[PDB]
Design a protein around this ligand. Structure first.
Ligand SMILES: CN1c2c(nc(N)[nH]c2=O)NC[C@@H]1CNc1ccc(C(=O)N[C@@H](CCC(=O)O)C(=O)O)cc1
Ligand SMILES: CN1c2c(nc(N)[nH]c2=O)NC[C@@H]1CNc1ccc(C(=O)N[C@@H](CCC(=O)O)C(=O)O)cc1
Lengths: 271, 267
């Protein structure tokens, strides 16, 4: 039961020097422009990540959430490695979006799951635990099962969950995409209504022409069954690959979306 | 295994090549042969002239190509008699492009190659034309392999081309390509499956973008060889990145070496 890839726009992230500077400077215009441009490029969710010191995170996420929601109604994806921070900002969202993320580490599921029980929030769940990020397929598939079982005990349906198998660098494991595809097959076999999600950038660390590698990884992971991804939709070459691959996978009737993005100059040479 | 690359550029349909043929421009043909350095395993040669000029044209292109490179020839003609008349001009065995169940293509070509090391591209079509489903193509592939085995031609010498059709004509074109490839290689694990890239993107804009993403998807689906333009640097980067992503480039070295030599990446 296939569907277009769900795009989580990654650009409002304080690890990016220009955004860290905008947060320090309180430059709303930059954040507003990234929210709007990503929405216009087709993002389904706008990721927001403070990447500041811990005791500034909550107030910075609230500031980012305010600016994004003034500019656009595209729902938020709240990105924090600190579940307490997510808890403290969830009420600032005007509508339900995505929480990024829970995992089996520490008390992430004990904090976040009661937080979204009975709501329409969706959640990204990473296949990692207190021992770290496993490289092998079996361990990640077992973590996903445990996460889905813990979510079920708060009445969170599989359709609300996006499992992120945390693909590692191809230079660290040349089987990284093969394992990604095999974990995706096994997870979806167990849970046919679940989503599988990934970032695009980790795969190319340690290789030249990262943008080339990331774009080929996207195409392969889409064919392997990826449902959502955290990516940069302002990258015109990546967007042309995404839309060509949607048409090649039979998901763009009469190739109309591809033809329209070309006609509007969203992809191809900048006119 | 790494994808087998049949370099497509020496084809008289391309106006610069047509003109070089008419001028006897040797340098232009040698240069395409030698540059297709880019990794080609076979150099396609296709005259694309009138019927009565094709044999002498092919002999000229084969002569000039083999002066430039020892990379073997892929002799591309729709006329099996032309292939018969030029096979002896090759200095070493290569690929014949192509046979199919149409007319007498198998009956002319297979006796010439029986007991030799020549390989052959075999298209899934017959006298009624290009087939109208996946099943028909898989059944034609089975008939081609059986005809070939009656001349002692092993499956590893055959590259079955399932003749992918334009995505704008049928939005399932790649889904069906991948299904036929999976079924053919299930029946015959030692056979190769091959394709051209360009047909898929007919009637769409940004055809090079569509061709490149079709390459990456078809490689994951199991394609073994492809006739393509390996002088297109963006296509070669995608081809090499996809080889590394499919676990076929140990420590991503071929990719890193191609970047370090400026074979891919900004000029
Ligand atoms: C680890 N990634 C990740 C995640 N969240 C989850 N669940 N999974 C993930 O893999 N959150 C953080 C990051 C995804 N976000 C980002 C954000 C920006 C860039 C980045 O490098 N941006 C550059 C280059 C963009 C491009 O290549 O087009 C930029 O200049 O904005 C990478 C990842
Ligand atoms: C039908 N294609 C084909 C085949 N043989 C078989 N077995 N299968 C096939 O699909 N032989 C002919 C052709 C492949 N040959 C070619 C040769 C050149 C171009 C061509 O359009 N070349 C342009 C564009 C190059 C590019 O996109 O990089 C050129 O300028 O060279 C297309 C197909």
């Amino acid at each position: 039961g296939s569907h277009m890839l769900i795009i989580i726009g990654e650009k409002i992230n304080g690890t990016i020097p220009s955004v860290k500077k905008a947060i320090e400077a309180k430059d709303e215009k930059l954040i507003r422009d990234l929210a709007l441009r990503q929405s216009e490029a087709g993002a389904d969710y706008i990721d927001v990540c403070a990447s500041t010191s811990p005791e500034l995170e909550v107030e910075t996420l609230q500031w980012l959430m305010d600016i994004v929601q003034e500019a656009t109604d595209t729902p938020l994806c709240i990105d924090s490695p600190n579940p307490r921070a997510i808890q403290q900002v969830l009420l600032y969202a005007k509508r339900p979006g995505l929480i990024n993320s829970v995992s089996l580490e520490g008390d992430k599921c004990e904090v976040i799951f009661p937080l979204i029980q009975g709501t329409s929030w969706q959640v990204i769940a990473l296949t990692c635990d207190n021992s770290g990020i496993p490289q092998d397929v079996q361990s990640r598939v077992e973590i996903a099962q445990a996460l889905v079982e813990k979510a079920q005990s708060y009445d969170i349906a599989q359709e609300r969950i996006h499992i992120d198998p945390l693909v590692i660098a191809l230079s660290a494991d040349n089987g990284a995409l093969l394992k990604f595809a095999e974990a995706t097959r096994q997870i979806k076999a167990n849970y046919p209504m679940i989503n599988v999600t990934s970032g695009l950038s980790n795969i190319s660390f340690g290789m030249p022409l990262r943008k080339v590698v990331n774009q080929n990884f996207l195409t392969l992971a889409m064919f392997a069954g990826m449902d959502s991804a955290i990516l940069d939709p302002l990258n015109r070459d990546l967007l042309a690959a995404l839309l060509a691959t949607e048409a090649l996978l039979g998901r763009d009737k009469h190739c109309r979306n591809f033809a329209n993005a070309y006609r509007k100059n969203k992809i191809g040479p900048l006119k």
